[PDB]
Amino acid sequence: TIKDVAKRANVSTTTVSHVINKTRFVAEETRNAVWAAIKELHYSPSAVARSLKVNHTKSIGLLATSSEAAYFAEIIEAVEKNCFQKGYTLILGNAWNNLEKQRAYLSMMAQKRVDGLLVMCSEYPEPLLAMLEEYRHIPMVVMDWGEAKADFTDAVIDNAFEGGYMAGRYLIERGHREIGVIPGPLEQNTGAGRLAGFMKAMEEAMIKVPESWIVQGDFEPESGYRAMQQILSQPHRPTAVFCGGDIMAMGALCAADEMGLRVPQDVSLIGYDNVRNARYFTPALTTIHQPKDSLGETAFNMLLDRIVNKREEPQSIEVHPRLIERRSVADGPFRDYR
Amino acid sequence: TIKDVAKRANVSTTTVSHVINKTRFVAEETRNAVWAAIKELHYSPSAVARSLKVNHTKSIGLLATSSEAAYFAEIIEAVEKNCFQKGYTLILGNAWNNLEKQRAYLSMMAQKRVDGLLVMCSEYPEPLLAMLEEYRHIPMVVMDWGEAKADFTDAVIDNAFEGGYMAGRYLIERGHREIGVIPGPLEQNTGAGRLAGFMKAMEEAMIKVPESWIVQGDFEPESGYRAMQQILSQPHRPTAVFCGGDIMAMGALCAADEMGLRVPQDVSLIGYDNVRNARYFTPALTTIHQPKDSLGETAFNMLLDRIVNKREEPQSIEVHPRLIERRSVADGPFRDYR
DNA sequence: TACGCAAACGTTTGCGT
DNA sequence: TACGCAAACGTTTGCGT
Numbered sequence A, B: 001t002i003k004d005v006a007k008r009a010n011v012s013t014t015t016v017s018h019v020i021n022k023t024r025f026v027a028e029e030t031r032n033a034v035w036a037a038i039k040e041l042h043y044s045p046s047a048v049a050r051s052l053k054v055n056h057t058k059s060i061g062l063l064a065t066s067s068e069a070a071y072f073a074e075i076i077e078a079v080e081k082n083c084f085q086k087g088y089t090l091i092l093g094n095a096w097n098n099l100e101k102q103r104a105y106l107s108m109m110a111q112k113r114v115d116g117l118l119v120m121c122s123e124y125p126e127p128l129l130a131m132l133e134e135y136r137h138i139p140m141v142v143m144d145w146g147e148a149k150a151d152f153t154d155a156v157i158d159n160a161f162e163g164g165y166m167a168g169r170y171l172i173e174r175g176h177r178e179i180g181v182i183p184g185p186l187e188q189n190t191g192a193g194r195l196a197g198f199m200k201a202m203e204e205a206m207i208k209v210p211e212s213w214i215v216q217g218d219f220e221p222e223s224g225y226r227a228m229q230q231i232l233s234q235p236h237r238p239t240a241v242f243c244g245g246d247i248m249a250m251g252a253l254c255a256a257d258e259m260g261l262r263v264p265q266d267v268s269l270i271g272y273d274n275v276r277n278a279r280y281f282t283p284a285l286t287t288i289h290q291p292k293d294s295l296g297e298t299a300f301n302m303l304l305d306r307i308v309n310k311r312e313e314p315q316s317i318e319v320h321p322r323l324i325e326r327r328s329v330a331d332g333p334f335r336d337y338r
Numbered sequence C, D: 001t002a003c004g005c006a007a008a009c010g011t012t013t014g015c016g017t
């Protein structure tokens, strides 16, 4: 159809191209005519044709775990924002932690020839790790690892451990010694790593966490609900709880209130993520803020660089979690004695 | 590079193609050899090339308003799910209710030659309505209108009005007569239309809503926060409130609790949307459920049909909101007298 | 029987003059 | 000076035989 514009304007398609892309000087008169035709014919230059010659789709693929969850959604929206402002197209794909599902999206992606790949798979087993390598040719970066699990990628690291540690400390310095915890899946960084940072602070204080007091969550509110219950549903209960994710926390707040417990009057609660509306939780959730925006932007940028600047060597960039004091924590029994 | 496989297998690329796409019979021996080469060479057939000949990207574009908001996120995730199971690729784009931003994504989209277009722009002013028509050639459907604003599209309609009406009725039959309302933007369907359905029920009951009792929201929790405040922050206050969206409601729950008010003991609250975790609100939010999944799937399907079955004529499909009784509403003063 | 030739899809771009 | 020719990018597919 570019052919059709060239004719209507009586110029070569080469010309047409040049004016459309300002790739070389053209007579105004000529330039005009082209736009003229361009408009009447109602022209929309074909990207795929172009992509075919230039060799780049100017589109990036996001191999995500899921997009509904608050945590994720925010990250994603960050990424999309950046793509748009730098003219890239976002192809979103959720594998739900499913090998097949990943092998598929991964394949489709390579095929649609995405210029780069953003990865957020939560769990990374060897098998997944392998498929990924089969694509070391597509520039890509993973945004959810603790350390650098691999050499053929870029990685932005959250310091989830330093965060877990912050949370514990807070509780400690608040007067708490009987603390419980609902961690996220141990196969994730935000799971394992947050718990570890937490357990360090505990040990550093000679606080021991009774196993009856640590209940696995899955980041989903319901899991928070059940955990909380299980904890305060026992003879001896902690006076403070550290919840691996704000959304699970939201679920833990529900149960307490449902058992007639008072937060924080009866139970102090500290979360992790600092989701967009954790502030409007009841009560306003005190939590650890993960820089989701900076995490998105920072990944998109490494990707660009590798893309444009054709970087070959891996790179990792750390980001930093920080404490947000809201209203779900109260002084503990030992505040005064310190 | 298909050329490179044909050579390694000593067959024509035509052959190579045929085996890759099972488009015609091939000797096993031959078939094998092709796969053989296909693998060693580590082949990934180029989609863009293919798309270029066949004339279809097998990818759909989602021109959304925003993807962070719960309501939206869920819808989106629904759409994505369907795309994947029918082999389509999802290109996600947020215009944030910005004409330019829309004209851009719209353009990029046409250019990347998306097979179809899914639209969720919230507000549709004439200008936006016009740009859209410039693309009546791309098969597309809008998922957020009340009625059929246009002839060149398909439309799934939510019956938000029948929903608004349901909510009012509930409150009424619960014993309430002094009700307030925090509606969503009047320029949206889920805004205006929900309010209307509500106001009908009121009129049908000779209940009059004092203007001091209706405060505009923007679907964002903060707006809920402020509204609630403004309402219960006055001499004479309603005994029940109808909130246009669960997330705003979440914001209204926060304020009440912050003013030391009890929900529902002091104020009964009814929301709208039935977001994934409205159940884990405190208290568990009684609300109107919008079938988000069915809304996504139902749109993707109309789109497919128009796509594959090459349908030319518009079509609209209604979906139905329904009441979910949770724990934020209590009997009102007039329950017994009815 | 089972396969191959060559044109075409819509662009960009190296040389020209 | 300001522009045009033709090849190429990686596929599918109508005819062949």
Ligand code: HPA
Residues within 6 Å of the ligand: A069, A071, A072, A122, A188, A190, A191, A219, A245, A273
């Ligand atoms: O994997 C996750 N899922 C949901 N919320 C989260 N917050 C941190 N990590 C996660």
Ligand code: HPA
Residues within 6 Å of the ligand: B069, B071, B072, B122, B188, B190, B191, B219, B245, B273
């Ligand atoms: O436009 C909207 N935004 C957020 N939540 C909503 N729920 C219904 N409509 C909307």
